[PDB]
Amino acid sequence: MAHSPPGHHSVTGRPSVNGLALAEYVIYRGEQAYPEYLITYQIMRPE
Amino acid sequence: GTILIDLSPDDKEFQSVEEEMQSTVREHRDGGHAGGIFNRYNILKIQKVCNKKLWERYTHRRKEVSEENHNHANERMLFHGSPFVNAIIHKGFDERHAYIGGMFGAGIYFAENSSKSNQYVYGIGGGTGCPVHKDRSCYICHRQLLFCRVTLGKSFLQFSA
Ligand SMILES: O=c1[nH]c(-c2ccc(N3CCCCC3)cc2)nc2ccccc12
Ligand SMILES: [Zn+2]
């Protein structure tokens, strides 16, 4: 893995074009996330 | 050391996780190429992931980050989709789970939009889709996402397309 930018612990990807998109985030240390919930699902075919 | 505890659909905890999953679906600029064509999910199961060693590893790092950032971990709940979700729940996140070719460099990626993480369930760009039907828009096969506690600390803001 790469390093976080100096003086930072993560990167936030802010959308600058698609007004409806929410943010995405990047961490560079596996210890900075805990997998709290496992969700099992299907995508649904639109009617 | 991981155990999985089923949540009842009557549990407020199940319901708040389902609502975050459903309410953060959006349309994608690929028209559904990577993740499939859908507006909502059929939630089949929500399990709590319990591993004391992995939790202590998380909270140890969280304290380090908080102490470097005026006692503020900047903790979020975020989605992660990956073909290696089974490995993650047993062994934790590490460099093997990084997206080397990601827009913000080789790190581990998380999304506010559940549908963004859904694009990665079968690999980068949806890979070749589900293992059984080779369909990135498969409506039959069971998919899995993680809803994760993530420490951001001081986060570098990247404005991007
Ligand atoms: O949930 C996400 N997963 C992934 C993701 C990307 C790549 C991978 N791998 C796992 C290790 C093998 C090579 C690629 C696993 C997960 N990328 C995202 C990018 C943006 C927003 C969300 C995600
Ligand atoms: Zn399938």
Residue numbers in the entry:
A (entry chain I): 1115 to 1161
B (entry chain A): 952 to 1112
From the study:
Two homologous tankyrases, TNKS1/ARTD5/PARP5a and TNKS2/ARTD6/PARP5b, catalyze a post-translational modification, poly-ADP-ribosylation, of target proteins. Tankyrases are enzymes (EC 2.4.2.30), which belong to a family of proteins known as human Diphtheria toxin-like ADP-ribosyltransferases. Tankyrases control β-catenin phosphorylation through regulation of the stability of destruction complex by ADP-ribosylating Axin and therefore inhibition of tankyrases offers an attractive strategy for treating cancers with increased Wnt-signaling. Tankyrase inhibitors interact with the NAD+ binding groove of the catalytic domain and they bind either to the nicotinamide subsite, the adenosine subsite or span across both sites.
